[model samples]
Target chain A: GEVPIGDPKELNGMEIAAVYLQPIEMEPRGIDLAASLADIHLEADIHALKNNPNGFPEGFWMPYLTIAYELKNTDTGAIKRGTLMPMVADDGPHYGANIAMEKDKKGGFGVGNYELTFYISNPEKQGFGRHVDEETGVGKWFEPFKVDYKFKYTGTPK
Target chain B: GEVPIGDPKELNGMEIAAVYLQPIEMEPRGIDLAASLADIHLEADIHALKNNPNGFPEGFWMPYLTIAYELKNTDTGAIKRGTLMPMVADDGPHYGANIAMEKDKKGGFGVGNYELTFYISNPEKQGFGRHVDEETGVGKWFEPFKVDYKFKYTGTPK
Candidate 1:
């Protein structure tokens, strides 16, 4: 109803998917990304690679989904860019990877609509997978691509 | 070599494709839009639809790409958003349609690197193509998506 994942403690009794993954390999993968006020999570849904561009990845998951984000303040049009990391909780493999944001640089996030953007790069370019074949070699990532969403920071303005 | 389309005068003797079009019917149509110095052009490469998405389209072009762009000033972190329209040259069909920017709305654009973004929307959603068929009707369009490119604004600072 509010943020994408709800409260962190809510994971206490939550049911999550089976465990599976790796590091460094992605192809502008299709993903579900959302911000829960000061926190965000990214779940890999579909990845584009055959033969790993000749065939496909071995399973449903890839390693690090190297991504960067920018948050533009709707009111001032100011922007802050940072890296989003892959994470797992000691609580368990409860959900997709996530990272926390700096609600306070000197102060907390302002109260208003904040436009969010995620830039996805080719896993090959990031040195993830290798396709060294004469034919069916998946060369050239589709250049980096981007997606957008908005989150309202209704907390007390800092 | 520099900009995507080169000099606009270069279009004076350029060989372009034949004419084809319409107004406001896009299903996140794939396009090739580029900024040439101060000028610009957008060519509809492929559109996603059948019967339109049920099948393909009658031709390869579309009308009113109806796109909105935002340029983020690299040096100062300010952004300016505006509408991009459909255009043609007096010489002939020339190339993809385009529009000019406010290089001097106040002064000219700031010198240095500027990040550019293009947002694509569904033709049906923008009040264009409609497939009212009870069956085989291509329903939902993907949410508006974004693409990015960067240009070095080697011009006098605004």
Candidate 2:
């Protein structure tokens, strides 16, 4: 299974839809430790975004997704943090990513339970804004950037 | 307050007990928009470990602690993960550590809430053990090193 980067526009401003974690294949299904003893994947159905007329390089209206991951070794409580690389796939209407830990370092793949958390950031350029203070009328740039979606899964390493 | 490195022997057999997080001299508090607008600190109480007779540098009995942190941006559902360096102390029946999120990378601290977790390990020598199935037996080591404690807080930077 692969990580998906849906139409970034759909996730503009804290708006997310049809989010869930499942193995790749027929459809989004439930968890089974044994089935994920080697590797697991993700699938998300985000609302579609309106096309940015300016294009994907303007850095203003163009939007894209950033997927971050936190993988934990439940036994030793060790964690591996990184971005989920988007895989190339031309199939359904969702985005996804996969994981497979080895049996070393943090006890690798399926020997113990691990917690997997995903952080999907805003589609718009992060920390980009202009504002005038309500009290002083002073101008401010780059208001606040935030993640638009979050999902977690706890099971054996896949 | 300071971070404690209790007796290494207590953590010899992958053992840990009594873990919790607390603030200094203040009541279990709440977050303010500008109050914690810079940085924050934390203290922990992990059950003390027993001193080992085999000593603290057996290459096998050596023990130490590992701290893991997860800072979450509640607004955007973003998360930051890193290790917390335990602070040194002169007097203590417990263990502890402190954290200060800069007001830059994480919007300079107060812009979000964070989740902090700690893990203790076996000295500097990890992956110590023996096995028969793999034909690698040196007398099965302690085999367990864990968080031994966890805590979470939501507040602005100090």
Candidate 3:
């Protein structure tokens, strides 16, 4: 798969790189024949942007985030959504969540022009308890933010 | 750079894989001549263990925790400690913290028998607030825990 999804985007205070590749056969297979032909493998590589006048080190890990994606097919306005789990590949650590596709009346991704959007929620919203018990304290991740990307698939599975 | 630091250990519901390799010179190389040569790259790959006799997905991402390491030299009992941040590389998402050698008394790493221990604290302590505002909601990550590994350095840096 090519990139940006283009360039890495700095949103809120995050340096985010998003990409997708062929679908993988998961252990639980979701179903049967369905599992054999799942969808795409989506990944989001997130970090604290170096441009941060924010005073943290470059490429620092931003932890405990809730992330998800929504894909809206442009031609028909159809949609599919799912959650991305924090995970690592042979490539190191990032985020991924696999989904078996069901669209245009089938099971898996169909060739088309797609609009992809990523939604992220900070720790506070996901039950982060900030403790200021003793003295000083740290700040928070910017409010939950969303970003968009574009992709057009042209061929079949590998 | 194999892996005990061998098999991934399941401590407090997390599947952890620890490994190391030649040190990488960071953009902010610490010092100058020092930056020119680093010690080692240490990485920790963490996930939810398959033994969900407790029921979360195997390999599920565990978020927002504090991770650190204590490398103890059994030969002389000297120690070095540091924090590990969440980050992703070409392989996938994992935690890593790089350190330069400063033993037998140099600016880089020396060869010896070593005891490496990992310490982890759950998100609750790191200000994670579990929300019950809307519904029953989710529970918490287990209590803080620690695990150790042994390594013997041989030659020099890359």
What TM-score, over all chains together, does every model reach? 0.30, 0.26, 0.47
Worst 10 residues of 2 chain B by lDDT: B128-137
lDDT, candidate 3, at B120: 88
Evaluate residue A124 in candidate 2 and report its C-alpha lDDT on the 0 to 100 scale.
Answer: 26
Give lDDT tens digits, candidate 3, residues B81-132: 8877654343334566656655236322466777788898875454343321
After TM-score superposition, the amount by which residue A146's alpha carbon in candidate 2 deviates from its true location, in angstroms, is 57
In candidate 2, chain A reaches a TM of: 0.40
On DockQ, the candidate that comes out on top is 3
Which prediction has more favorable DockQ, 2 or 3?
3
Q: Which candidate is the best by TM-score?
A: 3
* Superposed Cα deviation of residue B73, candidate 2 (Å): 5.1
lDDT of 2 by residue, B15-123 (tens): 3333222222211122211223324444333332243222221221121344444555455565555543322121222233233445435453443443444455432
* Model 3 agreement with the true structure over A77-116: per-residue lDDT tens digits: 7788887765433343456654454432543456677788
Candidate 2 vs candidate 3: the lDDT winner is 3
**Candidate 1 global CA lDDT score:** 0.36
Question: Weakest 10 consecutive residues, lDDT, candidate 3 chain B?
Answer: B129-138
lDDT of 2 by residue, A43-133 (tens): 4333322332211111211113455656665676667765543221222123344345552345444445555554666432322111121
lDDT of 3 at B29: 26
